[PDB]
Design a protein around this motif. Structure first.
Motif, PDB file in Angstrom:
ATOM      1  N   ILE A 223      15.999 -12.134  13.480  1.00 42.55           N
ATOM      2  CA  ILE A 223      15.385 -11.586  12.246  1.00 42.55           C
ATOM      3  C   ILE A 223      14.013 -11.570  12.470  1.00 42.55           C
ATOM      4  CG2 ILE A 223      15.002 -12.576   9.923  1.00 42.55           C
ATOM      5  CD1 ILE A 223      17.774 -13.862   9.943  1.00 42.55           C
ATOM      6  N   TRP A 224      13.308 -12.292  13.541  1.00 43.02           N
ATOM      7  CA  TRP A 224      11.879 -12.073  13.679  1.00 43.02           C
ATOM      8  C   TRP A 224      11.702 -10.790  14.125  1.00 43.02           C
ATOM      9  CZ3 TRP A 224       8.402 -10.937  17.732  1.00 43.02           C
ATOM     10  CH2 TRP A 224       7.183 -11.531  17.464  1.00 43.02           C
ATOM     11  N   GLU A 225      12.597  -9.839  14.760  1.00 41.30           N
ATOM     12  CA  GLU A 225      12.401  -8.577  15.112  1.00 41.30           C
ATOM     13  C   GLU A 225      11.971  -7.838  13.582  1.00 41.30           C
ATOM     14  OE1 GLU A 225      15.513  -6.962  16.801  1.00 41.30           O
ATOM     15  OE2 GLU A 225      14.791  -4.954  17.459  1.00 41.30           O
ATOM     16  N   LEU A 226      12.768  -8.062  12.941  1.00 40.33           N
ATOM     17  CA  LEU A 226      12.447  -7.263  11.267  1.00 40.33           C
ATOM     18  C   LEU A 226      11.365  -7.740  10.540  1.00 40.33           C
ATOM     19  CD1 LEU A 226      15.838  -7.063  12.346  1.00 40.33           C
ATOM     20  CD2 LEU A 226      16.130  -6.675   9.674  1.00 40.33           C
ATOM     21  N   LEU A 227      11.513  -8.829  10.109  1.00 35.16           N
ATOM     22  CA  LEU A 227      10.247  -9.453   9.334  1.00 35.16           C
ATOM     23  C   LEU A 227       9.193 -10.217  10.461  1.00 35.16           C
ATOM     24  CD1 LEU A 227      12.289 -10.626   6.405  1.00 35.16           C
ATOM     25  CD2 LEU A 227      11.386  -8.323   7.017  1.00 35.16           C
TER      26      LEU A 227
ATOM     27  N   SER B 270      12.573 -14.646   1.660  1.00 39.37           N
ATOM     28  CA  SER B 270      11.981 -14.226   3.135  1.00 39.37           C
ATOM     29  C   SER B 270      11.592 -12.929   3.094  1.00 39.37           C
ATOM     30  CB  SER B 270      13.351 -14.172   4.134  1.00 39.37           C
ATOM     31  OG  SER B 270      14.269 -12.960   3.504  1.00 39.37           O
ATOM     32  N   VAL B 271      11.995 -12.026   2.197  1.00 36.97           N
ATOM     33  CA  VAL B 271      11.393 -10.646   2.160  1.00 36.97           C
ATOM     34  C   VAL B 271      10.387 -10.405   1.094  1.00 36.97           C
ATOM     35  CG1 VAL B 271      13.898  -9.589   2.381  1.00 36.97           C
ATOM     36  CG2 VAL B 271      12.831 -10.026   0.173  1.00 36.97           C
ATOM     37  N   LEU B 272      10.028 -11.594   0.261  1.00 35.41           N
ATOM     38  CA  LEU B 272       9.012 -11.321  -0.911  1.00 35.41           C
ATOM     39  C   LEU B 272       7.563 -11.546  -0.022  1.00 35.41           C
ATOM     40  CD1 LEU B 272       8.296 -11.079  -3.950  1.00 35.41           C
ATOM     41  CD2 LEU B 272       8.057 -13.645  -3.909  1.00 35.41           C
ATOM     42  N   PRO B 273       7.210 -12.404   0.839  1.00 37.59           N
ATOM     43  CA  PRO B 273       5.894 -12.074   1.611  1.00 37.59           C
ATOM     44  C   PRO B 273       5.797 -10.938   2.317  1.00 37.59           C
ATOM     45  CG  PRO B 273       6.933 -14.459   1.815  1.00 37.59           C
ATOM     46  CD  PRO B 273       7.958 -13.451   1.263  1.00 37.59           C
ATOM     47  N   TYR B 274       6.962 -10.385   2.954  1.00 39.95           N
ATOM     48  CA  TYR B 274       6.598  -9.341   3.673  1.00 39.95           C
ATOM     49  C   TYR B 274       6.693  -7.848   2.552  1.00 39.95           C
ATOM     50  CZ  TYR B 274       7.785  -5.719   7.286  1.00 39.95           C
ATOM     51  OH  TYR B 274       7.781  -4.596   8.142  1.00 39.95           O
ATOM     52  N   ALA B 275       7.142  -7.906   1.819  1.00 35.72           N
ATOM     53  CA  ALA B 275       7.179  -6.640   1.082  1.00 35.72           C
ATOM     54  C   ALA B 275       5.778  -6.564   0.214  1.00 35.72           C
ATOM     55  CB  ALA B 275       8.353  -6.668  -0.276  1.00 35.72           C
TER      56      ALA B 275
ATOM     57  N   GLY C 246       5.295  -2.004   2.343  1.00 35.76           N
ATOM     58  CA  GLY C 246       6.193  -1.312   2.011  1.00 35.76           C
ATOM     59  C   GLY C 246       7.485  -1.765   2.429  1.00 35.76           C
ATOM     60  N   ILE C 247       8.555  -2.082   1.973  1.00 32.46           N
ATOM     61  CA  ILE C 247       9.983  -2.378   2.654  1.00 32.46           C
ATOM     62  C   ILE C 247      11.012  -1.501   2.323  1.00 32.46           C
ATOM     63  CG2 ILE C 247      10.520  -3.652   0.685  1.00 32.46           C
ATOM     64  CD1 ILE C 247      11.467  -4.420   4.374  1.00 32.46           C
ATOM     65  N   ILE C 248      11.701  -0.861   3.144  1.00 29.51           N
ATOM     66  CA  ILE C 248      12.927   0.142   2.969  1.00 29.51           C
ATOM     67  C   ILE C 248      13.999  -0.738   2.905  1.00 29.51           C
ATOM     68  CG2 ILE C 248      14.030   2.101   4.158  1.00 29.51           C
ATOM     69  CD1 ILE C 248      11.408   2.524   5.536  1.00 29.51           C
ATOM     70  N   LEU C 249      14.781  -0.101   2.042  1.00 28.56           N
ATOM     71  CA  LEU C 249      16.198  -0.833   1.930  1.00 28.56           C
ATOM     72  C   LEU C 249      16.986  -0.984   3.088  1.00 28.56           C
ATOM     73  CD1 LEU C 249      17.223   1.000  -1.640  1.00 28.56           C
ATOM     74  CD2 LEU C 249      16.247  -1.147  -1.473  1.00 28.56           C
ATOM     75  N   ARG C 250      16.675  -0.104   4.013  1.00 28.68           N
ATOM     76  CA  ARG C 250      17.372  -0.271   5.336  1.00 28.68           C
ATOM     77  C   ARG C 250      17.128  -1.704   5.964  1.00 28.68           C
ATOM     78  NH1 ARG C 250      17.205   0.076  10.729  1.00 28.68           N
ATOM     79  NH2 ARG C 250      18.486   1.263  11.813  1.00 28.68           N
ATOM     80  N   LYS C 251      15.830  -2.123   5.834  1.00 25.47           N
ATOM     81  CA  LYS C 251      15.885  -3.510   6.274  1.00 25.47           C
ATOM     82  C   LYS C 251      16.070  -4.552   5.329  1.00 25.47           C
ATOM     83  CE  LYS C 251      11.554  -1.972   7.537  1.00 25.47           C
ATOM     84  NZ  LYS C 251      10.117  -2.167   7.878  1.00 25.47           N
TER      85      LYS C 251
ATOM     86  N   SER D   4       2.804   3.779  -3.399  1.00 20.23           N
ATOM     87  CA  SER D   4       3.385   3.799  -4.852  1.00 20.23           C
ATOM     88  C   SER D   4       4.076   2.465  -5.033  1.00 20.23           C
ATOM     89  CB  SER D   4       4.238   5.017  -5.078  1.00 20.23           C
ATOM     90  N   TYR D   5       5.110   2.292  -5.422  1.00 19.29           N
ATOM     91  CA  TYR D   5       5.752   1.407  -5.686  1.00 19.29           C
ATOM     92  C   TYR D   5       5.926   0.537  -4.601  1.00 19.29           C
ATOM     93  N   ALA D   6       6.352  -0.745  -4.791  1.00 24.20           N
ATOM     94  CA  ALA D   6       6.503  -1.649  -3.518  1.00 24.20           C
ATOM     95  C   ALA D   6       7.659  -1.467  -2.649  1.00 24.20           C
ATOM     96  CB  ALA D   6       6.408  -3.283  -3.841  1.00 24.20           C
ATOM     97  N   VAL D   7       8.711  -1.321  -3.490  1.00 28.55           N
ATOM     98  CA  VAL D   7       9.987  -0.845  -2.692  1.00 28.55           C
ATOM     99  C   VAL D   7      10.128   0.792  -2.490  1.00 28.55           C
ATOM    100  CG1 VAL D   7      12.570  -1.267  -2.522  1.00 28.55           C
ATOM    101  CG2 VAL D   7      11.128  -3.068  -3.482  1.00 28.55           C
ATOM    102  N   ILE D   8      10.314   0.973  -1.146  1.00 24.49           N
ATOM    103  CA  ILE D   8      10.443   2.537  -0.907  1.00 24.49           C
ATOM    104  C   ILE D   8      11.816   2.868  -0.972  1.00 24.49           C
ATOM    105  CG2 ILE D   8       9.614   4.396   0.498  1.00 24.49           C
ATOM    106  CD1 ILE D   8       7.240   2.764   1.286  1.00 24.49           C
ATOM    107  N   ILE D   9      12.285   3.994  -1.542  1.00 21.19           N
ATOM    108  CA  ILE D   9      13.646   4.296  -1.736  1.00 21.19           C
ATOM    109  C   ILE D   9      13.439   5.667  -1.643  1.00 21.19           C
ATOM    110  CG2 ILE D   9      14.133   2.336  -3.060  1.00 21.19           C
ATOM    111  CD1 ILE D   9      15.403   3.927  -5.051  1.00 21.19           C
TER     112      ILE D   9
END
Ligand SMILES: CC(C)(CO)c1cc2cc(NC(=O)C3(c4ccc5c(c4)OC(F)(F)O5)CC3)c(F)cc2n1C[C@@H](O)CO
Ligand SMILES: Nc1ncnc2c1ncn2[C@@H]1O[C@H](COP(=O)(O)OP(=O)(O)OP(=O)(O)O)[C@@H](O)[C@H]1O
Ligand SMILES: Nc1ncnc2c1ncn2[C@@H]1O[C@H](COP(=O)(O)OP(=O)(O)OP(=O)(O)O)[C@@H](O)[C@H]1O
Ligand SMILES: CC(C)CCC[C@@H](C)[C@H]1CC[C@H]2[C@@H]3CC=C4C[C@@H](O)CC[C@]4(C)[C@H]3CC[C@]12C
Ligand SMILES: CC(C)CCC[C@@H](C)[C@H]1CC[C@H]2[C@@H]3CC=C4C[C@@H](O)CC[C@]4(C)[C@H]3CC[C@]12C
Ligand SMILES: CCCCCCCCCCCCCCCCC
Ligand SMILES: CCCCCCCCCCCCCC
Ligand SMILES: CCCCCCCCCCCC
Ligand SMILES: CCCCCCCCCCCC
Ligand SMILES: CCCCCCCCCCCC
Ligand SMILES: CCCCCCCCCCCC
Ligand SMILES: CCCCCCCCC
Ligand SMILES: CCCCCCCCC
Ligand SMILES: [Mg+2]
Ligand SMILES: [Mg+2]
Length: 1173
Positions: A215-219, A321-326, A330-335, A653-658
């Motif tokens: 998971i360290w690879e992603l976040l 886990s995703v909140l401090p990264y997003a 920007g976080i993509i739904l893929r991750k 723009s928005y935090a979550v990118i879709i």
């Protein structure tokens, strides 16, 4: 039976467990007959496992300073344990790396994602191979763990029995039947299934470390914010597991206490019905169950949070886990989905595998260290000579039953006793009741080590106990007792015991299968069989402890002058007798009184001086309301989730990118968090777990109530161990395993149903895509259960031979060591273990076959779905793969739901077996004068059986004492039992002008006061035994104890009227038990009373108490006194002589004895001159 197919099978067939195919094919069409159960593998026979572990445990004791049983196991089961461990770990590594391929394939559906599309075709083959590898790598390891666990449990159970046969005399008072039965039952099926989880202690840390690195690879650095939540959860979860064991250890004592009393009352249920004590016993058991269930609920509440920690962790671990990264980038739904696809594994690794592994290590090591304590208790020493002058000599012997009193040096049981007999002197031991004669024999056998003095004799000894012990089996098996069947000696012994006239009455003429304790036989028939067993074995010394108890004077004289003085004239034989005629023919006479040797010498110098789930839910009215409550809230959460998804797609723009084309990930994300949105909180979980436990209380109360009121004929068919199994193991399942497993099954069922429903409403083709898999699951399950249900019942019933044998061995332990027949019962116990092993091993293998096929079918479907998905993706927007792969993500959870359903149905076998007892049939001032009339009475134990009594007719007047005599085994106790209507009867017996059917059965029985032949005493205080209903103050209890002469014996013990009896009142002598039942009858003032052998073994001096209390206390009530001693006939006026299944009344004793010359000629002279002036 057939050899095990495991011996000669293909390696490919053994890997896939295809050798269980025939029984499943046979078990689908018709029922499984006895010709189908395969024999156990040779490497599983109890003998080889017992020999192996015994050898290692013997070496361990002989080598180390501090012996540990776990060390002995570590040398004979570790290597295969670890060898399967590495394969189990490789199966889990395959599972934690799956998202690297599944998430990389799912991302290929988007045209904007070129990179992971170019290699998607290779990943399809790699993913296919990954699934196939895991299937062949995870299941065969688990079966190996189960196989190792079964070997360990068998090998330890053998050593338990090996030690039980050698336990010292004074430790038996602390180790009751309920202690062994609880010890066996708790581990009977838990220990074997436990080893499948024992490896996650060291697997889970590796899984956490690998996943956290992956998971360290992603976040890049925010993954640890999600890990800290799980670390706190694990610490909290381990705290609850520690807390659970505190409530479970407090419960062990009060459940063992229940299992003793439950067995005591039910093996003597004949006396309980005669006393009308059903309600008293039910209240006593329910007072014990109250505290047990209180601890069970307090344990179940904690175990609920221990179980539900997984479901309420999904949304939080992902979110935290995703909140401090997003927030920072920007976080993509893929991750987001790929993080979810890792958390779904990380959560189960640290919240459902690791704590279960730790708890199992807690339990198994606790049981092993408890059995290690069992194996190191005080042992019976046998240091004695094997060759001597055959001259039994004793000198200056004293003894104490209580270890502390003898350690200080409280009257010693014996003091300064000595005697000598060379080669055939008949030494007649005599004395008053409780002076100590049985103890004198136990000192000789080595059952009671004398603190001072010496005792010398030859090795070979024979023993006829004062209390008969009949092992299960035919009369022949009881007589020979595990040696070669010699025709000539067998016939001579039976003729000497005069058993010919009584055995001839039986249907099979020799082979009637006797129940445990010989309830099928009379009182005197068991005594003569116990005598015949002693006579048959050749020994230097014969210890005949008062065999002439229940015999009439005619048979007593014949058996004494044909079997004791004629058959064995040249063998030393110590005989305990009170009749004066036996002391005439004795070469030595030893009179004992209060432990002192009153007189020793020759007599000459003496004179010189499927409708189960439905009924389980309907049994309680609150359970259906809680289930409706859990369903109503579920609909609200589904409705809220549905509208939330609908209102997100209709929005922009928005935090979550879709992107527009990547929006399909929203549904994949939802499936990974649906477990938390549908999770049952403490507002739904605790009510369900709470209500599932009170069902067990009602079922137990109903089951015990129905059993206590069953007709006696139905009770004689069932074995003692079948009852003990259904009270210990079955009820334990209904409290420990059924509630939480049902909760998990319901929870998973809700998750799957909700995840299917809301997805189907939004995308109405995923439902169609999953139907061919759901239907396949249900079809395979319905095929397997047709055999699994029958296999589970066969294994469940296979536990009763173990419990019957354990109860029989512990009850008769004193005879086993006297004869030295331990190896015969050791191999007999190993037959019971192998019988149980065959069914359990077969069932455990067929279940493994289902587990492999239920995963293989999922693997086949998934491999099929990936290829069509990969190939269909054209020039972007691969819709077909978006719909299909989602349909197969949910089935990864439905497979878990199906496996939980199998466990629920396997455990529901216990519910059905308890319901089988509830459906058992039910057999269903006035007594001013006591005049009764019998007209055309017929009695017969079994319906359609031999008529023990036919057309009996007689009448007695009010205030008249009536004698009831006859030869041993004529029907005396049957006639007295016919009054109370325990056995099936015809005719009518009215009292004071009211017929049988005019009055309810329990009101009828309450008019009588009964003294049964088999004295019943349960564990408890003296005042509880004298009146369980607690309807008498201590003043009247003492006033009766003074009249019956229990004063001296009661006050000896430290707790006056408070001493807790153990082992059915082993502390009291036999004569004290007769006085106990006499006081019990005197307290219950009844206008009519039936006395079946009050003076069983009481000497004529003690009989003065019997005649005094019957003359004074039973003033005007009619007495039906069944007695064998002729001195007792002086009191009763009318005499009922029973012979040839018929009764005839005489008004005078002189006419009775004039009729029967041979009866008269046997009477002792002191009684002959009494009757004839
Ligand atoms: C290597 C080392 C770290 C140090 O020598 C070690 C090995 C080891 C093995 C076992 N138990 C087993 O190999 C078996 C086993 C028994 C009981 C079971 C069960 C498996 O799993 C369960 F949980 F179900 O209970 C298969 C028999 C153990 F108990 C403790 C062990 N220790 C610690 C050491 O300090 C012990 O002296
Ligand atoms: N297992 C025991 N533990 C402690 N005390 C015992 C035990 N068995 C008997 N006693 C007590 O020791 C005394 C003598 O024991 P008991 O077996 O020996 O007499 P007995 O020979 O059987 O008498 P009887 O002739 O009435 O059958 C009695 O006071 C009795 O209560
Ligand atoms: N439950 C039973 N089922 C079948 N036969 C039984 C049963 N109980 C007893 N019998 C048989 O009935 C016969 C008489 O029973 P039993 O009560 O009557 O003898 P008894 O005269 O009372 O004994 P004792 O003189 O030793 O006190 C015996 O042959 C016995 O084996
Ligand atoms: C006890 C064992 C299982 C621990 C294994 C730790 C593994 C999974 C860890 C340790 C170091 C990690 C690597 C460290 C650096 C990088 C570079 C980055 O651009 C991609 C991820 C990658 C390539 C990591 C992948 C995961 C990794 C290889
Ligand atoms: C294997 C390594 C890498 C990780 C540590 C493993 C954990 C699970 C080990 C380390 C110490 C262990 C404990 C040590 C002592 C006992 C007391 C015994 O009566 C029951 C088991 C119990 C309670 C053990 C349970 C498992 C345990 C907590
Ligand atoms: C346990 C969950 C903690 C959530 C909060 C994370 C820390 C706050 C995140 C936002 C930080 C914004 C920094 C802006 C810096 C501008 C110079
Ligand atoms: C379970 C919580 C459900 C919340 C639903 C919120 C609905 C908001 C509707 C907004 C409509 C705006 C129209 C212009
Ligand atoms: C036997 C365990 C091997 C574990 C190897 C993990 C490799 C993870 C991928 C690293 C490169 C992306
Ligand atoms: C057993 C471990 C298998 C790991 C396979 C990782 C494959 C990564 C390929 C990445 C290509 C871009
Ligand atoms: C560029 C080609 C990449 C091929 C990756 C193959 C991965 C195989 C994994 C096998 C796991 C058992
Ligand atoms: C490395 C071997 C497998 C892991 C076993 C650890 C169990 C420790 C238990 C300690 C009991 C005293
Ligand atoms: C227990 C977690 C270990 C994570 C190691 C990460 C190393 C990154 C270079
Ligand atoms: C297993 C059959 C799946 C059929 C999917 C059809 C999808 C049409 C858009
Ligand atoms: Mg005795
Ligand atoms: Mg009788």
């Amino acid at each position: 039976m057939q050899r095990s197919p495991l011996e000669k099978a293909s390696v490919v067939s053994k890997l896939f467990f295809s050798w269980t195919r025939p029984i499943l094919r046979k078990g689908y069409r018709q029922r499984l007959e006895l010709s189908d159960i395969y024999q156990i593998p040779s490497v599983d026979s109890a003998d080889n496992l017992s020999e192996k572990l015994e050898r290692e445990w013997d070496r361990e004791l002989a080598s180390k300073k501090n012996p540990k049983l776990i060390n002995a196991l570590r040398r004979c089961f570790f290597w295969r344990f670890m060898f399967y461990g590495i394969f189990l770990y490789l199966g889990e590594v395959t599972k934690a790396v799956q998202p690297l391929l599944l998430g990389r394939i799912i991302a290929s559906y988007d045209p904007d994602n070129k990179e992971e599309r170019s290699i998607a075709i290779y990943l399809g083959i790699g993913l296919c191979l990954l699934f196939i590898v895991r299937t062949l790598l995870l299941h065969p390891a688990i079966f190996g763990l189960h196989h190792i666990g079964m070997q360990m449990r068998i090998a330890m159970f053998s050593l338990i029995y090996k030690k039980t046969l050698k336990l010292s005399s004074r430790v038996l008072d602390k180790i009751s039947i309920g202690q062994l039965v609880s010890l066996l039952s708790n581990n009977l099926n838990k220990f074997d299934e436990g080893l499948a989880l024992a490896h996650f202690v060291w697997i889970a840390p590796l899984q956490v470390a690998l996943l956290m690195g992956l998971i360290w690879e992603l976040l890049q650095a925010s993954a640890f914010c999600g890990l800290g939540f799980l670390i706190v959860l694990a610490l909290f979860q381990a705290g609850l597991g520690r807390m659970m064991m505190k409530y479970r250890d407090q419960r062990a004592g009060k459940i063992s206490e229940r299992l003793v009393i439950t067995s005591e009352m039910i093996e003597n249920i004949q006396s309980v019905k005669a006393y009308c004590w059903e309600e008293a016993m039910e209240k006593m058991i329910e007072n014990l169950r109250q505290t047990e269930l209180k601890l069970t609920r307090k344990a179940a509440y904690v175990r609920y949070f221990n179980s539900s920690a997984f479901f309420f962790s999904g949304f939080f671990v992902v979110f935290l886990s995703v909140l401090p990264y997003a927030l920072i980038k920007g976080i993509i739904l893929r991750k987001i989905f790929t993080t979810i696809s890792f958390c779904i594994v990380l959560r189960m690794a640290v919240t459902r595998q690791f704590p279960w592994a730790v708890q199992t290590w807690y339990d198994s090591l606790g049981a092993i260290n408890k059995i290690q304590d069992f194996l190191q208790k005080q042992e019976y020493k046998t240091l004695e000579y094997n060759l001597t002058t055959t001259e039994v000599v004793m000198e200056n012997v004293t003894a104490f039953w209580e270890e502390g009193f003898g350690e200080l040096f409280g009257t010693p049981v014996l003091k300064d006793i000595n005697f000598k007999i060379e080669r055939g002197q008949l030494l007649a031991v005599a004395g008053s009741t409780g002076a100590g004669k049985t103890s004198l024999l136990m000192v000789i056998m080595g059952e009671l080590e004398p603190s001072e003095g010496k005792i010398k004799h030859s090795g070979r000894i024979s023993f006829c106990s004062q209390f008969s012990w009949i092992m299960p089996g035919t009369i022949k098996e009881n007589i020979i007792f595990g040696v070669s069947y010699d025709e000539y000696r067998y016939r001579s012994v039976i003729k000497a015991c005069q058993l010919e006239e009584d055995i001839s009455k039986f249907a099979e003429k020799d082979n009637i299968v006797l129940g445990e304790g010989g309830i099928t036989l009379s009182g005197g028939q068991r005594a003569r069989i116990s005598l015949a067993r002693a006579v048959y074995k050749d020994a230097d010394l014969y210890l005949l402890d008062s065999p002439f108890g229940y015999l009439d004077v005619l048979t007593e004289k014949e058996i004494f002058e044909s079997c004791v003085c004629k058959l064995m004239a040249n063998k030393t034989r110590i005989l305990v007798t009170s009749k004066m005629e036996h002391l005439k023919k004795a070469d030595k006479i030893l009179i004992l009184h209060e432990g002192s040797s009153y007189f020793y010498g020759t007599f000459s110098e003496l004179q010189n001086l499927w409708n189960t789930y439905l009924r389980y839910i309907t049994v309680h009215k609150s359970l259906i309301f809680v289930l409706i409550w859990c369903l109503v809230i579920f609909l609200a959460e589904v409705a809220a989730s549905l509208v939330v998804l609908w209102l997100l797609g209709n929005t922009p723009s928005y935090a979550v990118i879709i992107t527009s084309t990547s929006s399909y990930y929203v549904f994949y994300i939802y499936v990974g968090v649906a477990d938390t949105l549908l999770a049952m909180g403490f507002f739904r979980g605790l009510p369900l777990v709470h209500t599932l436990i009170t069902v067990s209380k009602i079922l137990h109360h109903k089951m015990l109530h129905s059993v206590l009121q069953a007709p006696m004929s139905t009770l004689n068919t069932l074995k003692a161990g079948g009852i003990l199994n259904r009270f210990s193991k079955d009820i334990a399942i209904l409290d420990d395993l059924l509630p939480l497993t049902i909760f998990d099954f319901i929870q998973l069922l809700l998750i799957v149903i909700g995840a299917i429903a809301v997805v189907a409403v939004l995308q109405p083709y995923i439902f169609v895509a999953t139907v061919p898999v759901i239907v396949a699951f249900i079809m395979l399950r319905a095929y397997f259960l047709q055999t699994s249900q029958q296999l589970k019942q066969l294994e469940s019933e296979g536990r009763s031979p173990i419990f019957t044998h354990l109860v029989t061995s512990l009850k008769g332990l004193w005879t086993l060591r006297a004869f030295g027949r331990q190896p015969y019962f050791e191999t007999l116990f190993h037959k019971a273990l192998n019988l149980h092993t065959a069914n359990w091993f077969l069932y455990l293998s067929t279940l493994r076959w289902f587990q492999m096929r239920i995963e293989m079918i999922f693997v086949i479907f998934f491999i099929a779905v990936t290829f069509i998905s990969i190939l269909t993706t054209g020039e972007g927007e691969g819709r077909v793969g978006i719909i299909l792969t989602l349909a197969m993500n949910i089935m990864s959870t439905l497979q878990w739901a199906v496996n939980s359903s199998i466990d629920v149905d396997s455990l529901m076998r216990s519910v059905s077996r308890v319901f089988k007892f509830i459906d058992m049939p039910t057999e269903g001032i006035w007594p001013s004068g006591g005049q009764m009339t019998v007209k055309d009475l017929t009695a017969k134990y079994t319906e359609g059986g031999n008529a023990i009594l036919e057309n009996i007719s007689f009448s007695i007047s009010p205030g008249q004492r009536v004698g009831l005599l006859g030869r041993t085994g004529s029907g005396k106790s049957t006639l007295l039992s016919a009054f109370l209507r325990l056995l099936n009867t015809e005719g009518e017996i009215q009292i004071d002008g009211v017929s049988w059917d005019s009055i309810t059965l329990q009101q009828w029985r309450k008019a009588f006061g009964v003294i049964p032949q088999k004295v019943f005493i349960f564990s408890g205080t003296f005042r509880k035994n004298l009146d369980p209903y607690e309807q008498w103050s201590d003043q009247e209890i003492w006033k009766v104890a003074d009249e019956v002469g229990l004063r001296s014996v009661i006050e000896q013990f430290p707790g006056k009227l408070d001493f807790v009896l153990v082992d059915g009142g082993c502390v009291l002598s036999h004569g004290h038990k007769q006085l106990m039942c006499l006081a019990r009858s005197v307290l219950s003032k009844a206008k009519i009373l039936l006395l079946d052998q009050p003076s069983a073994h009481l000497d004529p001096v003690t009989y003065q108490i019997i005649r005094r209390t019957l003359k004074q206390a039973f003033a005007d009530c009619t007495v039906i006194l069944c007695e064998h001693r002729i001195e007792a006939m002086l009191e009763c006026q009318q005499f009922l002589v029973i012979e040839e299944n018929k009764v005839r009344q005489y008004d005078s004793i002189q006419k009775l004895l004039n009729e029967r010359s041979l009866f008269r000629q046997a009477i002792s002279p002191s009684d002959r001159v009494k009757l004839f002036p």
